Amino acid sequence: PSDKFIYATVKQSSVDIYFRRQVELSTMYRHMEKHNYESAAEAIQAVRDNKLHAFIWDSAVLEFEASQKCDLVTTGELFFRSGFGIGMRKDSPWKQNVSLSILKSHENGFMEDLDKTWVRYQEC
């Protein structure tokens, strides 16, 4: 328990279940519970005013915000691997068709095209 540092995260979304099922570090999850913040923006501001020291979150979002602001440093190593998907009801041909369309977007090059369209020029 490092009370001098601040270990906070989003209260509900993703790391909640990860640490709940993680089992062995239940005390770490309990500390996160007493340091739970229900906003990415409020966590960013808590980092801003030095009321928060360490904040665990996703990779792309955190690195993009750090590049945009270039007043904070991102040092944690990618200790997790995951992707972002699209969900729908348990009976959907839309699911198969959108999977095919998304893989088509990946193959053609539209994916990194929009990536460089929306991520570039926001880097210090």
Partner: protein, 436 residues
């Protein structure tokens, strides 16, 4: 209209009471239609009552008969086979098993195999116990006739069973062939009505047996309360659902309000047991979803002694790897990855514990298969040869009070001589601590 067809087929004191017990309960007139007696005679009495004049109790087919008569006459009645059934249509009468299952499952949880022979109640109780058990992380475990029971005895210790009056004794003829009627097992019955087994436990309504006069007075009082509720805003035919006027009754300063289905919402119950001396001792009571009883310690207050193993672990509280914390008030217990620790010397406040020693203890217990209990010593810290007697863990172990003890113990001469220590899993010694 205030007719009380007190049929006893008897109750000489109750028959003689009549208006006297009602006056004790006692506003309009509250007479009694005392009749002592067959269905034809009952029909004649009721037709005479509904023609001229404009609560039944006997030992236990009567329920369908009374339901049909109430439906035909559209007149409320009270049954005191009293509480015995799905409703049919609009008709008023009085008489739960599901509540009994709930309460017994609770009291089992704070302190397995379930079978039966033949009933619709069999499937009803199987469904209800499935609904009760699938949550709260209770833990699923084992979900002529005597020859079959020999074929199983399939390997649990707590046994749940229920039947009518015609299966208990006829099956007990072989004494269930496995000594489960003794202290080595338990038997739980739904109690549909209340050559003889032992170690039996049962549940009953609040009024198990108080008095015939008391119960008839309660029936008269609830009838009068229902009539008064009918008199609200001034709210019988011979040749409806009045239960809507039964939402608030508080006679005898107890929960008396009834449900629209004829059931009493949130009633009071008692849990009793039949000792070897054939005495129906009361284990405890339960009301408003709260139970009171005689305090057990781990499992030995139910007269269970040693299922065919339990370890009486003793340890001392101090702060390196060993840590303690109180049970969470919201849950009433410790965290998910912890162990129930009893900080007692044998009101016991729960104080769970955790640590490296706890981890290794649980790992070895799982890998080798022992049940165990945790004890906290309140006599010294470890133990010394004061006047020959020992305290702490050594004192507990030496006098067989604690079968085995764990914690930070340093193997020595006399301690090895009188303890027989095991392998030194972790290392230590004597060292110095100084500042910079």
């Amino acid at each position: 209209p205030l007719n009380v067809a007190l049929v006893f087929s008897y109750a000489a004191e109750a028959a003689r009471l009549g208006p006297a017990v009602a006056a004790a309960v006692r506003l309009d007139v509250r007479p009694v239609a005392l009749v002592l007696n067959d269905p034809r005679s009952l029909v004649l009495q009721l037709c005479d009552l509904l023609s001229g004049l404009r609560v039944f109790e006997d030992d236990s087919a009567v329920a369908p008969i009374l339901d049909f008569l109430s439906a035909q006459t559209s007149l409320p009645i009270v049954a005191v086979g009293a509480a015995l059934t799905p409703k049919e249509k609009g008709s008023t009468f009085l008489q739960s098993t599901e509540q009994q299952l709930q309460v017994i499952f609770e009291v089992l949880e704070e302190y397995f195999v379930a079978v039966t022979t033949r009933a619709p109640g069999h499937r009803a109780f199987l469904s209800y116990i499935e609904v009760l058990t699938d949550g709260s992380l209770v833990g699923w475990e084992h979900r002529a006739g005597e020859a079959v029971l020999s074929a199983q005895l399939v390997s649990a210790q707590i046994r749940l069973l229920f039947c009518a009056r015609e299966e208990a004794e006829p099956v007990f003829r072989a004494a269930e062939e496995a000594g489960l009627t003794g202290s080595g097992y338990v038997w739980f019955m739904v109690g549909p009505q209340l050559p003889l087994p032992a170690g039996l436990f049962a549940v009953r309504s609040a009024g198990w047996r108080d008095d015939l006069a008391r119960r008839v007075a309660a029936g008269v009082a609830v009838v009068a309360r229902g009539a008064q509720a009918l008199l609200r805003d001034y709210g019988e035919l011979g040749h409806e659902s009045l239960h809507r006027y039964f939402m608030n009754i508080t006679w005898d300063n107890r929960d008396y309000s009834f449900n629209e289905d004829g059931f009493l919402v949130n009633p009071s119950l008692v849990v009793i047991s039949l000792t070897r001396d054939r005495t129906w001792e009361v284990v405890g009571s339960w009301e408003q979803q709260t139970l009171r009883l005689k305090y057990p310690l781990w499992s030995r207050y139910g007269r269970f002694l040693q299922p065919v193993q339990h370890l009486t672990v003793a340890t001392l509280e101090e702060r390196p790897f060993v840590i303690v914390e109180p049970a969470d008030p919201i849950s009433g217990t410790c965290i998910r990855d912890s162990v129930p620790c009893r900080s007692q010397l044998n009101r016991p406040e729960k104080r769970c514990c955790k640590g490296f020693c706890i981890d290794i203890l649980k790992r070895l217990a799982h890998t080798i298969g022992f049940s165990y209990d945790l004890y906290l010593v309140t006599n010294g810290k470890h133990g010394k040869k004061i006047d020959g007697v020992w305290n702490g863990m050594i004192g507990e172990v030496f006098y067989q009070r604690a079968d085995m003890a764990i914690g930070s113990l340093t193997i020595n001469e006399e301690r090895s001589e009188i303890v027989d220590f095991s392998v030194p899993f972790v290392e230590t010694g004597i060292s110095v601590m100084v500042a910079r």
